[PDB]
Amino acid sequence: HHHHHGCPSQCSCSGTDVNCDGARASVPAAIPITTQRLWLSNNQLTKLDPGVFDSLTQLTTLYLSNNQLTALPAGVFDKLTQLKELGLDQNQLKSIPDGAFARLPSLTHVWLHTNPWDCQCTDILYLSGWVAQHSSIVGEGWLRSWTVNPDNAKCSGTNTPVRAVTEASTSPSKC
């Protein structure tokens, strides 16, 4: 269509890219269901509505980096089965809900660094096992600077890698 495109206010859209980075506290409504790449980085997010992404089944890239996310809701990524890139770095996450990445078989780039992962608490063990089993996709940087480095998901206060934590060192009382 001549000089006509199909976009959330304060975001910029082109093709199936939706750039909502840096608009500032909640995920905008009416992100098109055909969206393949979604930037939600550099906003004010401290939580997500459960189900917020459930209609965006064609997503291949999702950036949530550099928010202040304190927790993710269980199942929040369950519908994003075509996701290849998932950015969660530079947030305030202490653990990942059990099973959160289980339905994401196509991941090739995952960013988890610069979060205060709480490795003494029982709830770290899903993430510890996941990183240990998917080490070749956990990294840092972008394009020319992309480098895999699974030890950059680090335990707050000791800087030990999250993937080295096993059940016998954790305690429910530290949650």
Residue numbers in the entry: -5 to 0, 2 to 19, 21 to 171
Paper quotes:
The resulting VLRB protein is a 15–25 kDa, crescent-shaped protein with a continuous beta sheet where its concave surface forms the antigen binding site. Herein, we report on the characterization of a lamprey VLRB that is specific for terminal 3-O-SGal, and was isolated from a lamprey immunized with human type O erythrocytes. This VLRB, termed O6, is the first reagent to our knowledge that specifically recognizes the 3-O-SGal determinant on glycoproteins with high sensitivity. To better understand the molecular determinants of glycan recognition, we determined crystal structures of unliganded (apo) O6 and a co-crystal structure of O6 in complex with (3 S)Galβ1-4GlcNAc. This O6 VLR is relatively small compared to other characterized VLRBs, containing 178 amino acids (~19.2 kDa) and only a single LRR variable domain (LRRV1) along with the other usual LRR and CP components (LRRNT, LRR1, LRRVe, CP, and LRRCT).
The sulfate group of the ligand forms hydrogen bonds with Gln86, His109, and the backbone amide of Gly137 in an identical manner to a phosphate ion in the apo structure. Comparison of the apo and glycan complexes shows no movement of the C-terminal loop and only small changes in residue rotamers (including Trp138), indicating that the VLR is preconfigured for glycan binding (RMSD 0.28 Å for 172 aligned residues).
